[model samples]
Target: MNSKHSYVELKDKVIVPGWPTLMLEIDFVGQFLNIPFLSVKEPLQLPAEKKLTDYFTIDVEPAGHSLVNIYFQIDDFLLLTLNSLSVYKDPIRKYMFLRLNKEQSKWAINAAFNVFSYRLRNIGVGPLGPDIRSSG
Candidate 1:
């Protein structure tokens, strides 16, 4: 996707897509020993077929390391920090997923209800357009 689109949903799956022009880089270190545990692709590309649920079940907390850094860059310019993330994997399926730390965002709760998705809350900046709040 692009900068304006925060996420993409397909059937029962969803994922946050990064900017097209920006290069995606991920750095992951084991929480217990500070050892590099995963070998990620440079300028990571979000696989269209890989869904968030392809890894661990959302309702059940899964085991594994819990930290990663995702970078958005273009040329020499690098975007700033990303909140600490919780990384999970389904060994049975050999799939991996990353979740935003609860302290950083309410993504877990939002995902539970599937409401108030990432959308512009108020159109036309500074109270110029109609209130776009979701009733739920």
Candidate 2:
């Protein structure tokens, strides 16, 4: 989405054809060890698929470790974060949303981190260091 449009406008424009699209990259490091834990690609678009359904996708992969990629999508207009995590016994998947309001955006960011934390705790693995990276 262009810088001219607000988040609301972007949401609406995404629904229709020929509207602007926005992509954001977020970087984060582990809290305790300062190890690079996550890399995120957040795409914001005008309403694309449905009224409340916008097109959003996330792909997360462990940096230097084993090949693990987590993917997720949001189906409605709700503002939230979704994540996929892999554990030894079972993979953990989470979908969470905050209402579309003042705090919604911040909440979404938190949701992403929440998933990362869950993966670390349950899987007994940490995000890979900066030396290890992945491409889109």
Candidate 3:
């Protein structure tokens, strides 16, 4: 629901054309984050329901602890580190469903959108459930 990454996409104009627009299509955010355009894949959660999970996040992990390599902390836990090293070298890390073109970028963005939308709708609130009371 309330994701740091989601807020970024909204306030930072990372969404207008959407995050993919900024990250992959426009190639600026990705360049800045050091997340190579072609080296990204949809982050999948466990029990893989063919989609992102309720509490999901995105990350870009740089190998060997380099200074230049930056990161996007989408959430606290569930480190969805994109693993720049492997993702960069391995073709298997790429998303084939989106055609490895601009379309892929867009699809990534759409999928990201779903991550936020799904959370916002499904798990929204702290303590809305019925409160327990003594029945003296």
Candidate 4:
């Protein structure tokens, strides 16, 4: 593949042709999509069952923690002080997007794909991407 064409790149952790990045990452979001997220490479947390579909009701309430998606929680947590941006979770696609109503973006980045998965298998010696979320 062309170097500039990669949606996401890593030293050795770049998405491979057959690598199940979605499946692996999905484990971080839980099983609200019916897709089996089974990545045994990078150190990831075993997500609790999060029916993102249920998160939709939050639009009708405040502090909808029980109806919240994990991504929303992380987005809330990732913000800097007084920042006016929020991350919105799309249950159907199991995707996260930005809701820029009141944020002073500490920074902005790019990312993609349904995965267009490759065949790579190493999570590398350490970590990949920027936080991978707080790759700290």
Candidate 5:
């Protein structure tokens, strides 16, 4: 998501705007970590039925490294990461949601989820349940 690399260069040529210096550092909160990206087609999990929306939900592998499926909006389709957590489940997955062209204020909650994945992953917590246990 920088001004470097072919992906970024193409991203630059297309649409998607930029942020000022102050905004850059602040937005850096959810930067993707050591996890790599995957291009294979036969790997990863499908999202919940409701999640498989009518709108084209562009998915990526982030290489199924941490949490497997990462979805990009047809427009947010940088082809990055997805949610579909297996938290505390074997292989340890995380979760998140993102909507492109939305207000920045809402993204902090998004950032928090992504950041937590790295933090817990850093601590080596895994082999947990894919289902989250919390009072509905």
Candidate 6:
């Protein structure tokens, strides 16, 4: 969804080592767009049973916007959430997910980032499922 505040452009396209850029972007967009909340979705192919192996899958769909899938495998008791914001630039679709470290917990964040990096490298920029712009 389009927001009054323009998308925050990164001076360098390099992904941050331990930040959920997409999630932060979504929060920014949601605030600018006057959205109350956002929804996170998981991959449909994941096992339905939640595993106790210290991993969880989450997908983020901003209010009034299309779905941005996020899969997280966490390994700590710390709280973690997926924040994603998507922007379509024609042939190159871009999205970012940041792992928020609640309660000053670092283990959860580290584990989450590790999983995210692996998925990002293997999957690259994923397919565009739906439009998340104001005009759409």
Best by TM-score: 2
lDDT of 4: 0.23
Q: Predicted candidate 4: what Cα RMSD to the true structure?
A: 18.1
lDDT of 4 by residue, 99-118 (tens): 21111111111111122221
lDDT of 2 by residue, 1-136 (tens): 5443111111221221221112223333333211122222333223345432233444443322223233444343333321122111111123311122333234334444333322211112234422232322
Rate residue 36 of model 1 by lDDT: 22
Which tens-of-lDDT digit does each residue in 4-63 have in candidate 5?
221211111121112110011122243433322221212333344622233233333332
lDDT of 2: 0.28
User: What does candidate 1's lDDT look like per residue over 3-118, in tens digits?
Assistant: 43221111112211221111112222111112122221122223357532232122213222342221111111111101111011211112233333443123223233222211
The number of the candidate with the highest lDDT is 2
lDDT at position 66, candidate 3: 23
Instruction: Please give the TM-score that candidate 5 achieves against the real structure.
Output: 0.16
CA-lDDT, candidates in order:
0.21, 0.28, 0.26, 0.23, 0.25, 0.26
lDDT (10s digit) by residue, model 6, range 1-136? 6644222222233332222222212112111111111222321122346432334333332221222223333333312322222121211112223323232223333333233221221112233433222224
List candidate 4 stretches off by more than 4 Å. 1-16, 22-32, 35-43, 46-95, 98-136
lDDT of 3 by residue, 1-136 (tens): 5632122211221121111111322222322111223322233224455333443433322223221111233332233333321123332221111122333344334343222222211121124222311121
Residue clash pairs of candidate 3: 15-18
Model 5, position 31, has a per-residue lDDT of: 45
Where does model 2 exceed 4 Å of error?
1-21, 30-68, 78-136
- By lDDT, the better pick of 2 and 6 is 2
Error of 6 at 15 (Å): 2.6
Supply candidate 6's per-residue lDDT for 78: 14
